């Protein structure tokens, strides 16, 4: 295209591009809250956790480290935090 407005693009183009090639750099990671079905302790787990985080009480394992995003165990429902 001969004329492209780079001052404000569409949001799906900002989502599509690399995290460093945007007009303003924004990370693709996020913070979230998980809870066990049995034990009731809401904790904060990073998306790319890269480590074994444990509940307060040491009963159930929350996540396993992977190459990218961490693998939450079955039954531990989650939702994204924002403000």
């Amino acid at each position: 295209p001969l004329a492209k407005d780079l001052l404000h693009p569409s949001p799906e183009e900002e989502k599509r591009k690399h995290k460093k090639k945007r007009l303003v750099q924004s990370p693709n990671s996020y913070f979230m809250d998980v809870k066990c079905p049995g034990c009731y302790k809401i904790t904060t787990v990073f998306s790319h956790a890269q480590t074994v985080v444990l509940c307060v009480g040491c009963s159930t394992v929350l996540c396993q480290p992977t190459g990218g995003k961490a693998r939450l165990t079955e039954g531990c429902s989650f939702r994204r935090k924002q403000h």
């Binding site: 001969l2 004329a3 001052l7 750099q25």
Partner: protein, 129 residues
């Protein structure tokens, strides 16, 4: 590595000018780039530009118009006197009716005509016509 940010900025501006684009994205800004673009605005070669302020190093989006032939940067910053400016005028400009030399004087970044008007000289930056 990246050693001359202004030369890269004018190289990208000249490349997108030859390509025919209407907007140029300069990734690293500087105060020198802002003064150079302000001079090119005030002499009517580029349009209305922006500074994309992030917290590391800002980006600049330049609205282009079809009035620019070439933007160049002389490297390194050769010191030039008032009697040595005419040599640069004959071996750098395409004509005497137009063309400007941006030089870094102690009174600020300005063109050669204002440098002759304020009776001062400095170091070379670049040229545009």
């Amino acid at each position: 590595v990246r050693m001359n940010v202004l030369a890269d900025a004018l190289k990208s501006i000249n490349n997108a000018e030859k390509r025919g684009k209407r907007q140029v994205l300069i990734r690293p800004c500087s105060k020198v780039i802002v003064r150079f673009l302000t001079v090119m605005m005030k002499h009517g070669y580029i349009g209305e530009f922006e500074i994309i302020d992030d917290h590391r190093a800002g980006k600049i989006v330049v609205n282009l118009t079809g009035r620019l032939n070439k933007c160049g940067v002389i490297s390194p910053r050769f010191d030039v006197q008032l009697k040595d400016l005419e040599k640069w005028q004959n071996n750098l400009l395409p004509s005497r009716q137009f063309g400007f030399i941006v030089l870094t004087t102690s009174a600020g970044i300005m063109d050669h005509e204002e440098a002759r008007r304020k009776h001062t000289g400095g170091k070379i930056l670049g040229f545009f016509f």
